[PDB]
Amino acid sequence: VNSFSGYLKLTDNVYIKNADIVEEAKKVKPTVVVNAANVYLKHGGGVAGALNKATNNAMQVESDDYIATNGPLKVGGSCVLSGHNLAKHCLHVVGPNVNKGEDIQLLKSAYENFNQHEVLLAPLLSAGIFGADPIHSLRVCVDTVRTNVYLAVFDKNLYDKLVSSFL
Numbered sequence: 001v002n003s004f005s006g007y008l009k010l011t012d013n014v015y016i017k018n019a020d021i022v023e024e025a026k027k028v029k030p031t032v033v034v035n036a037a038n039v040y041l042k043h044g045g046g047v048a049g050a051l052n053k054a055t056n057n058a059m060q061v062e063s064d065d066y067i068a069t070n071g072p073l074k075v076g077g078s079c080v081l082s083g084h085n086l087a088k089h090c091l092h093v094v095g096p097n098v099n100k101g102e103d104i105q106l107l108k109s110a111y112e113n114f115n116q117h118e119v120l121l122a123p124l125l126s127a128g129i130f131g132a133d134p135i136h137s138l139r140v141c142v143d144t145v146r147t148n149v150y151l152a153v154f155d156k157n158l159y160d161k162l163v164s165s166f167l
């Protein structure tokens with residue numbers, strides 16, 4: 001038994017809810033929150049801008065030190081950093097950006113990083129501000145992640161479409 005509430009169960013391991021990943025993290029304080037990162041960990045908008053704002057910019061300060069030491073992530077890659085006031089850890093995952101000409105098959109590579117963590121609260125990768133078809137992103141998630149993932153989709157219209165179209 002865990003602390004996540006109000007989720008619809010899609011599969012043995014994938015759960016979904018119409019929620020802001022930020023308010024959900026503040027309420028639950030999960031072990032892992034996933035950020036929809038870019039390779040530079042520049043948290044300017046969307047999930048990353050909203051998560052970073054909720055940390056009072058401490059996520060950006062930590063991220064700039066990470067990049068100064070390690071250089072950029074790979075598209076499809078990830079790193080584990082602090083979850084600050086939101087979670088124990090933040091898993092920064094880089095889904096492809098189709099607005100940059102970046103392989104949609106890197107989205108499966110992005111969701112494979114979730115399998116190193118038994119449970120995660122996560123957003124739909126490569127959606128919203130980043131561009132991909134969220135219905136596709138949910139299918140890849142279900143067919144790739146084997147650990148327990150709680151998806152917070154911040155669009156009720158899109159949430160209802162994802163649920164009503166889910167195979």
Ligand SMILES: c1nc(N2CCC[C@@H]2C2CCC2)c2cc[nH]c2n1
Nearest residue numbers: 020021047050123127128129154155
């Ligand atoms: C969850 N998803 C978030 N987005 C923003 C862009 C893409 C993603 C969803 C919007 C439908 C998919 C946000 C943003 C702030 N909080 C969020 N929580």
